[PDB]
A paper describes a structure:
We present crystal structures of both enzymes in complex with their [name] substrate, which was achieved using Fc engineering to disfavour preferential Fc crystallisation. We present crystal structures of [name]/[name] and [name]/[name] complexes, to a resolution of 2.34 Å and 3.45 Å, respectively, and map the extensive interfaces that are formed in these complexes.
We identified residue E382, which forms salt bridges with R255 in a neighbouring Fc molecule (and vice versa), in both Fc chains. In contrast, the [name] variant produced 9 hits in total, all of which were in JCSG-plus™; this variant therefore displayed a ~57 % reduction in crystallisation compared to the wild-type Fc. Crystals of the Fc [name] variant were found to have grown in an atypical space group P3221. As of August 2022, this space group has not previously been reported for a human apo IgG Fc structure; we did, however, find examples of IgG Fc crystallised in complex with a small peptide (for example, PDB 5DVK36) where the reported space group was P3221. Analysis of the crystal contacts revealed that this variant makes fewer interactions with symmetry-related molecules in the crystal (four salt bridges and sixteen hydrogen bonds), which are asymmetrical across the two Fc chains, resulting in altered crystal packing. Furthermore, as calculated within the ccp4i2 interface, the [name] variant had a higher solvent content and Matthews coefficient compared to the wild-type Fc, indicating that the molecules are less tightly packed in this crystal form. We conclude that crystallisation of this Fc variant has been rendered less favourable; this indicates that other substitutions at E382, as in the E382R and E382A variants, would have similarly altered crystallisation.
Numbering used by the authors:
A (entry chain A): 237 to 444
B (entry chain B): 237 to 445
The structure:
């Protein structure tokens, strides 16, 4: 009955020293008469301790949903250590195990280019500011937009796309009002990747 | 046990008269002692019998992967008929069914914009010509690149991405040699969509010194 789902830390957390990367180990479909679940975590085969098991979250479909969280070190994740979650329950015949780690492969540095709107789009009510990010490996990346320190949240980013070489690329599109573009406001495409210098770069975009 | 995944026809196939739109019905995780799969197709509740079941594709994880394909008519897809795939197998307690159709909703016309390389990229050996396609619904679209009549095939396109409004967008990236860009050659982003005037539009891109 019980199923297991081991999720990696958010890319933004693994690349920012201030944040705390967490590996979460979701267990679903737990019965009422077999409610006890027990986790064991391993890091390259080495038992680790002091995980945090959140309280049982009783579901709409008359089951439980237990979650155990393990905070991992920034360096250990980015060095590519394998984190294993061993679930044990009465309903299970044999303990389930899942393993997760950073996408293995030679890290490659993204080139970040900003592209302004076409003059055809300038006739429209709003305009699209484009940020090309290309040549990065692996596909674990985070792209954000901002003006000054204050962030812009009216943007979408495309899934990473595998190129002719081993690398990836993507586009991020910030939609702004035409007025604010023509007033000469500065927008900044911030990118975060493991292969970037200090895990961060930022390119600006303005009217000439 | 067995899982089912019903996929729509390639957007390029539904929009080109010469091509053949197909609905594929993938069945995964089939055991060795229950290898027989049997499909039944329906079009708005009407049984059809013109499918082709491909041979079992034995997987790396000691299971099979059976696929049944149904060719659909261009007009039937674009009119929005519902295609259903009913899988049956020993391992299943009750036959599984999945349904797919064209995304129902007011069709919206893509705006097509071409963007030249940044001057930072101009230092590199090759440069990237960008084609933004935005504001289209549904997500059935096809993008090609060309110079003159002859096509350019060194390009990649992103999956359609859902925007803040109901519409979609995507980017297509043509990689060309820096020389050919600076010689002032004209490249053309051709787009094909249900909502486009005559199901086709094309925007050009050049050095424009
Ligand atoms: C044994 O191996 C096989 C083979 O797997 C392959 O080989 C192994 C060795 C590994 O390397 C695998 O990584 C590799 O894939 C396993 O078979 C796989 O089984 C899983 C399910 O367990 C299937 O997952 C689904 O995948 C589809 C997307 O699949 C397309 O894209 C894949 C790459 O991205 C590609 O590999 C596939 O072939 C397929 O590509 C399409 O193929 C068709 C025909 O081949 C073609 O016409 C198309 O053009 C082509 N398109 C593209 C884009 O490539 C994904 O959509 C599914 O997601 C749904 O279901 C999930 C539940 O599993 C759920 O979590 C998701 O959220 C999602 O659910 C849907 O969500 C929408 C939201 O709007 C909702 O509306 C829907 O109702 C909802 N549906 C459901 C059912 O919930 C899903 O992830 C793999 O496709 C399949 N792989 C292959 C190649 O067949 C097998 O499982 C292994 N067995 C064991 C025991 O381990
Ligand atoms: C009772 O209800 C439970 C609650 O779930 C919700 O409601 C039910 C009714 C359904 O509608 C659910 O789909 C819905 O989620 C059920 O639990 C769910 O079980 C299913 C199947 O066992 C799980 O499916 C798996 O989902 C994975 C992704 O999971 C993330 O995203 C989900 C939403 O998109 C979210 O519900 C999950 O909690 C989880 O969220 C992430 O959590 C981490 C922290 O742990 C965060 O860091 C992320 O940011 C979160 N992200 C998001 C988007 O929220 C899939 O990855 C997984 O697919 C993989 O495994 C399968 C094999 O199973 C492969 O085939 C596949 O290729 C892939 O590798 C799978 O689809 C679902 O996630 C569970 N939901 C929750 C909340 O735990 C109970 O099952 C249900 N019980 C019964 C008896 O019906």
């Amino acid at each position: 009955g019980p199923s297991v789902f081991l999720f990696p830390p958010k890319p933004k957390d693994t690349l920012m020293i201030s944040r705390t990367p967490e590996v979460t180990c979701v267990v679903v479909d737990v019965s009422h008469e077999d409610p006890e679940v027990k986790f064991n975590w391993y890091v390259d085969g080495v038992e680790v301790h002091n995980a945090k098991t959140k309280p049982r979250e009783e579901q709409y479909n008359s089951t439980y949903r237990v979650v155990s969280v393990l905070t991992v070190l920034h360096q250990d994740w980015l060095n590519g250590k394998e984190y294993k979650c061993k679930v044990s329950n009465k309903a299970l015949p044999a303990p389930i195990e899942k393993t997760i780690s950073k996408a293995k492969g030679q890290p490659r540095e993204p080139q970040v280019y900003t592209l302004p709107p076409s003059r055809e789009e300038m006739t429209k009510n709003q305009v699209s500011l484009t940020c090309l990010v290309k040549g990065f490996y692996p596909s674990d990346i985070a792209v954000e937009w901002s003006s000054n320190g204050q962030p812009e949240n009216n943007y979408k980013t495309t899934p990473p796309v595998l190129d002719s070489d081993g690398s990836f690329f993507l586009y991020s599109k910030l939609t702004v009002d035409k007025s604010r573009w023509q007033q000469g406001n500065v927008f900044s495409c911030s990118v975060m990747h493991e292969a970037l210098h200090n895990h961060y770069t930022q390119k600006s975009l303005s009217l000439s």
